[PDB]
């Protein structure tokens, strides 16, 4: 779902004493208590759509001379510290999953509500795949460069 919505915070001397959530969405179980109080400070507006603008017309004239910078890919060397740094945080998540499977969130009397953060093995899978997809994404920008220019050679 394309989430989109404009709001406007009322200034001092015009805030309503009681106002329900005009545009209610999904909120994780952490900051849901502040949604029922801060909703009276602003209000949602009926968004519309139209075709005009002007900035989306001068970017083509620049691309005629700035096309040499759009091919500057090679993401494997740009944010190389973020890829290696993400493996250190994965080890802390994998260590928490070992204690989750050992203790178990299904006890006698009170089940599926023992530990605070459940499904640690399912959440650690997406974190491990994030370091894999981001690593192979930078390589695809380098292999595509060795197949169009490096495969030319000379007589």
């Amino acid at each position: 779902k394309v989430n989109l919505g404009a709001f406007r915070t009322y200034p001092k001397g015009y805030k309503p004493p009681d106002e329900g959530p005009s545009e209610y969405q999904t909120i994780p179980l952490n900051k849901i208590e502040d949604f029922g109080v801060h909703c009276k400070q602003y209000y949602a507006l009926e968004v519309s759509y139209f075709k005009s603008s002007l900035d989306r017309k001068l970017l083509e004239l620049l691309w005629n001379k700035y096309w040499v910078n759009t091919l500057s890919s090679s993401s494997l060397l740009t944010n190389a510290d973020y890829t290696t740094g993400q493996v250190f945080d994965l080890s802390e998540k994998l260590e928490q999953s070992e204690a989750q499977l050992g203790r178990g969130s299904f006890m006698l009397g009170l089940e599926t509500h023992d530990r605070k953060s459940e499904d640690k093995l399912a959440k650690a899978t997406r974190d491990s795949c994030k370091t894999t997809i981001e690593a192979i994404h930078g390589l695809m920008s380098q292999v595509i460069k060795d197949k169009l220019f490096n495969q030319i050679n000379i007589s």
Binding site: I144, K147, L148, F149, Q151, I152, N153, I154, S155
Partner: protein, 208 residues
């Protein structure tokens, strides 16, 4: 330069005789002229022979096809140079070995140009970078020289076939890679459509 090349080709076709012999020494002495293909094939320089007139014809052939060691072997038969004609011959020696091999080792240029160190050998190469003559990079680990851009010496009448051959592999080579990228998009999109249908029809029959 480029404006000076159209002035030397007009004065040589208007006069001949003793005036043509004096025009050859003025072109090699004046800088900016790095091409000698349009002046060697003309019939004005071919008529210079018998005596000192024949020495100017052999000197023009060495500046287009010969190299630096080819001039020191017959320096007594050819007229001497100055502080500007000798430095211009070293620029043509670098572009001569680049037309045959892609990378030239440092041991080859140290023997042809007769040097002792690497900075003095590369001192005559960096002077052609600011004049848009020789453009490339310097390698230190492999001790090679990857010449990317250089002068074509003459008008390129023999090695002109490599220009169309290199451009043909760049245009036709992109069609083979485009067929593989387009096929990968259709395979990745079809896998997502089949996975979304097999994950919704198996979960709806659990309640029934």
């Amino acid at each position: 330069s480029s404006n000076l090349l159209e002035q030397f080709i007009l004065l040589a076709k208007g006069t001949s005789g003793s005036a043509l012999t004096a025009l050859i020494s003025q072109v090699l002495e004046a800088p900016g002229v790095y091409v000698f293909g349009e002046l060697l094939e003309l019939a004005n320089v071919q008529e210079l022979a018998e005596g000192a007139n024949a020495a100017y014809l052999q000197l023009l052939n060495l500046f287009a096809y010969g190299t630096y060691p080819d001039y020191i072997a017959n320096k007594e038969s050819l007229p001497e140079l100055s502080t500007a004609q000798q430095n211009k011959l070293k620029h043509l020696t670098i572009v001569s070995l680049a037309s045959r091999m892609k990378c030239i080792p440092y041991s080859v240029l140290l023997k042809d140009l007769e040097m002792r160190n690497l900075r003095e050998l590369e001192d005559l190469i960096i002077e052609a970078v600011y004049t848009d003559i020789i453009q490339g990079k310097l390698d230190q680990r492999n001790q090679l020289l990857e010449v990317d851009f250089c002068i074509g010496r003459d008008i390129r009448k023999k090695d002109i076939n490599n220009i169309v051959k290199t451009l043909h592999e760049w245009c036709d080579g992109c069609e083979a890679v485009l067929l593989g990228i387009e096929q990968q998009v259709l395979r990745a999109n079809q896998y997502k459509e089949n996975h979304n249908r097999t994950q919704q029809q198996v979960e709806a029959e659990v309640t029934n």
